[PDB]
Design an enzyme around this catalytic site. Sequence first.
Site, short mmCIF file in Angstrom:
data_model
loop_
_atom_site.label_atom_id
_atom_site.label_comp_id
_atom_site.label_asym_id
_atom_site.label_seq_id
_atom_site.Cartn_x
_atom_site.Cartn_y
_atom_site.Cartn_z
N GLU A 1 0.81 -1.23 0.00
CA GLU A 1 0.00 0.00 0.00
C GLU A 1 0.84 1.28 0.00
O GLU A 1 0.34 2.37 0.27
CB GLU A 1 -0.94 0.01 1.21
N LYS B 1 13.40 -0.34 -2.01
CA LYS B 1 11.99 -0.07 -1.70
C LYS B 1 11.64 1.32 -2.20
O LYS B 1 12.26 2.31 -1.79
CB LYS B 1 11.71 -0.19 -0.21
N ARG C 1 7.54 -13.28 9.77
CA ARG C 1 7.32 -12.52 8.54
C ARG C 1 8.16 -11.25 8.48
O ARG C 1 8.34 -10.70 7.38
CB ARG C 1 5.83 -12.17 8.38
N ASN C 2 8.66 -10.76 9.61
CA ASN C 2 9.48 -9.56 9.61
C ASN C 2 10.96 -9.86 9.79
O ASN C 2 11.74 -8.94 10.11
CB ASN C 2 8.99 -8.60 10.71
C1 92Q Z 1 13.64 -4.75 4.92
C2 92Q Z 1 13.67 -3.58 4.16
C3 92Q Z 1 13.14 -2.41 4.72
C4 92Q Z 1 13.15 -1.22 4.01
C5 92Q Z 1 13.67 -1.19 2.72
C6 92Q Z 1 14.20 -2.34 2.14
CL1 92Q Z 1 14.84 -2.21 0.53
C7 92Q Z 1 14.19 -3.55 2.86
N1 92Q Z 1 14.71 -4.69 2.32
C8 92Q Z 1 13.90 -5.65 1.80
O1 92Q Z 1 12.68 -5.53 1.76
C9 92Q Z 1 14.47 -6.80 1.36
C10 92Q Z 1 15.76 -7.20 1.47
N2 92Q Z 1 16.02 -8.42 0.93
C11 92Q Z 1 14.96 -9.04 0.40
N3 92Q Z 1 15.06 -10.25 -0.16
C12 92Q Z 1 14.01 -10.97 -0.62
C13 92Q Z 1 14.24 -11.75 -1.76
C14 92Q Z 1 13.23 -12.53 -2.31
C15 92Q Z 1 11.97 -12.56 -1.71
C16 92Q Z 1 11.72 -11.80 -0.57
C17 92Q Z 1 10.45 -11.85 0.02
O2 92Q Z 1 10.31 -12.02 1.23
N4 92Q Z 1 9.42 -11.76 -0.83
C18 92Q Z 1 8.00 -11.84 -0.39
C19 92Q Z 1 7.54 -10.56 0.24
C20 92Q Z 1 6.02 -10.78 0.23
N5 92Q Z 1 5.76 -11.67 -0.93
C21 92Q Z 1 7.08 -11.83 -1.58
C22 92Q Z 1 12.74 -11.02 -0.03
S1 92Q Z 1 13.60 -8.04 0.57
#
Ligand code: 92Q
Length: 281
Positions: free
Chosen positions: A23, A42, A139-140
């Site tokens: 969202e 992100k 999940r986190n």
């Molecule tokens: C944790 C975080 C907070 C703020 C900004 C950023 Cl850029 C991040 N970093 C991330 O979200 C991530 C870091 N590494 C990640 N690797 C990753 C690779 C493949 C799949 C996923 C994953 O959990 N995917 C699922 C999320 C919900 N459905 C798909 C995560 S996500």
Amino acid sequence: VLKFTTEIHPSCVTRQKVIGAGEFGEVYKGMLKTKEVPVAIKTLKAGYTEKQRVDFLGEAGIMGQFSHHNIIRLEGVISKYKPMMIITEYMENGALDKFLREKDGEFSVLQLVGMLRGIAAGMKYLANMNYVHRDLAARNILVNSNLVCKVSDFGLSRVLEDDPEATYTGKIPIRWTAPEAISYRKFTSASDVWSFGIVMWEVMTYGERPYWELSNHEVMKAINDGFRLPTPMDCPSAIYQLMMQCWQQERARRPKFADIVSILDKLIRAPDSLKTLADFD
Ligand SMILES: Cc1cccc(Cl)c1NC(=O)c1cnc(Nc2cccc(C(=O)N[C@H]3CCNC3)c2)s1
């Protein structure tokens, strides 16, 4: 006093593949130049409430305050151009809950416990930095290709599931939350310790949902009557005893994260403890 967060030049970042969307925007896998490393990226939807913008940059601010092996590493932010981005290390195996459910039975108990030691060390650091997470759940947590688990989500706006003060205008689930946080809104590192106990159970069950199909009020009544989650199959007795300590109704009786790390270290170095299972009574 706070740390600045690195501002990353836009020519330094390339988005490659969407990995998730919410969202607020999306998360991509990408590459960052340094000489070129994978990162997660992100973005904030161009089309955001200002509330979202302050929440978005505020999340990057919180992440930039931490420096610990078991806390997701922030590489920087693109805050002065569109789209705005938060850039972290890329965790190859993604979210712990989905990962375990895809990998059921494939790890040793020693490996699972090492995963839990990592999480507990990250939480000890957060707690001693005076940061209450409020939303600790598998999940986190994110997992890299060394099986290292890092605490990862620091989004600002959170409301308790079924909060009666909420109206039609992310939610923290009741069944991960300590009783005093539900009953009188007291969120502390000790209520994070309760949730860590639930995370322990999630890991040891390869991602089973706590309390299965019980409703939120059936969970709360069960907890208040003294019932707790049962021992996962193959869970060492010492690990189940540790989760039960985390689930003490009285805050004061729960272990601190410092106690948890030490207990988990003890078992990992004496790993035949991890084959002594729980008996009956
Ligand atoms: C944790 C975080 C907070 C703020 C900004 C950023 Cl850029 C991040 N970093 C991330 O979200 C991530 C870091 N590494 C990640 N690797 C990753 C690779 C493949 C799949 C996923 C994953 O959990 N995917 C699922 C999320 C919900 N459905 C798909 C995560 S996500």
